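Why this split exists: single-chain examples teach little about how molecules sit against one another. For that reason, every record in the complexes split bundles all components of an assembly together and asks for one structure covering all of them. Below is a record exactly as it appears in the raw files.
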Amino acid sequence: MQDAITSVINSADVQGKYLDGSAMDKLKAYFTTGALRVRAASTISANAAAIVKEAVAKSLLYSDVTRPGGNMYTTRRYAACIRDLDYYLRYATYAMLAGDPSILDERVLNGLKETYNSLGVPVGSTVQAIQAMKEVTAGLVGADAGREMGVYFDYICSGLS
Amino acid sequence: GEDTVPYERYLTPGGYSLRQTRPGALREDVGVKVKVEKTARFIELGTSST
Ligand SMILES: CCC1=C(C)/C(=C/C2=NC(=C\c3[nH]c(/C=C4\NC(=O)[C@H](C)[C@H]4CC)c(C)c3CCC(=O)O)/C(CCC(=O)O)=C2C)NC1=O
């Protein structure tokens, strides 16, 4: 768990060097993008349940997975699916605020593949659900904030696949 | 000896003192010593390996 600042400090410390001009430029880049990160995080905190339910309405609804036999069939499985998608959106917001995806592979992508493979959860359908969540939130917060959200959404989909 | 045009073989100490000890023509050993330029030992010890 480290943001862009802590990773820059960790690189300069593992070097043992002081903060040179490249580290200063990286921190200036983060300190310019931080206000946009803050406003996108507020806008995403506004519409958590709406983004999640629009992602299910785009991908998972009216398909086979909500029908009998699907892994999203029962009300318990539906509630756990909404819980999993809320987790993905919340941690993508955290990784957007930090500017570093270390929290994603520390706390989402750690044992997620083995959990989903033990439960029988389809990984492709949940990857499509995360992609639709990314599409909806990029329609919500704009072009560049949607892109800096979608880089961590693509990180979650890549670590899941 | 009948093959070469002359050339300036000797200077006086006035003329050599004129041309060489000018600041751009100068070296930096020429008259007093220069000490060795090592890096600081606490920087050398603070690195990440011997
Ligand atoms: C914060 C990081 C983190 C994540 C992401 C996480 C996921 C996680 N998802 C689970 C279940 C689940 N996850 C899903 C989700 C899906 N199945 C589908 O068909 C859809 C494609 C997809 C949703 C988009 C479902 C249906 C279950 C329930 C499985 C069951 O009850 O048999 C379980 C099983 C235990 C429990 O429900 O409470 C865990 C631990 N745990 C974590 O600590």
